[PDB]
Amino acid sequence: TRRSQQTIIPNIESRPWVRGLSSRISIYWTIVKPGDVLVINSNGNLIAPRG
Amino acid sequence: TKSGSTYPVLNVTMPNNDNFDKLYIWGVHHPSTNQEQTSLYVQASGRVTVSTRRSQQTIIPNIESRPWVRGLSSRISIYWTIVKPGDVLVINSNGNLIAPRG
Numbered sequence: 419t420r421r422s423q424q425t426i427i428p429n430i431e432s433r434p435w436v437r438g439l440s441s442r443i444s445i446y447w448t449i450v451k452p453g454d455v456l457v458i459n460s461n462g463n464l465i466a467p468r469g
Numbered sequence: 470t471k472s473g474s475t476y477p478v479l480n481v482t483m484p485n486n487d488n489f490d491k492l493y494i495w496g497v498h499h500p501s502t503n504q505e506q507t508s509l510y511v512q513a514s515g516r517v518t519v520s521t522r523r524s525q526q527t528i529i530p531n532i533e534s535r536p537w538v539r540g541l542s543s544r545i546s547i548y549w550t551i552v553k554p555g556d557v558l559v560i561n562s563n564g565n566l567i568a569p570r571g
């Protein structure tokens with residue numbers, strides 16, 4: 419955003435099987451104030467928000 | 470450290486079947502020179518990933534010429550990980566691992 423950025427790099431490791439999977443997903447949150455803009459920049463491993 | 474000429478990608482597992490929680494104290498070695506990384510851990514850059522079924526910790530070692538403390542320009546970063554009953558400990562490392570003895 420125009421006030422805060424969050425750069426995340428995914429990790430590739432053999433994690434324990436949780437619910438039958440060795441891969442996970444890291445959820446974050448970002449708050450956009452009135453007037454602020456949301457800029458999502460990704461080249462892979464993105465769990466895009468619907469709204 | 471390296472054995473002969475190869476440092477394998479260690480992938481061990483240690484389950485917690487005990488009735489109480491376990492605390493594992495493990496560290497990560499940070500060499501002072503680029504030669505110290507290879508003449509001890511072979512690989513160009515190590516990686517320690519001590520993970521559980523609830524939390525993972527991926528550490529990348531730093532190679533910098535730090536001030537001489539106790540006659541050494543290299544340090545070791547100590548970390549921690551709590552394994553609850555039923556949880557499993559998975560240490561995944563290809564170098565720069567200061568493994569816990571217990």
Ligand SMILES: *[C@@H]1O[C@H](CO)[C@@H](O)[C@H](O)[C@H]1NC(C)=O
Nearest residue numbers: 431432433435480481482559
């Ligand atoms: C690591 O070891 C665990 C248990 O021995 C196994 O389930 C897993 O597939 C191994 N991962 C790799 C990358 O060897």
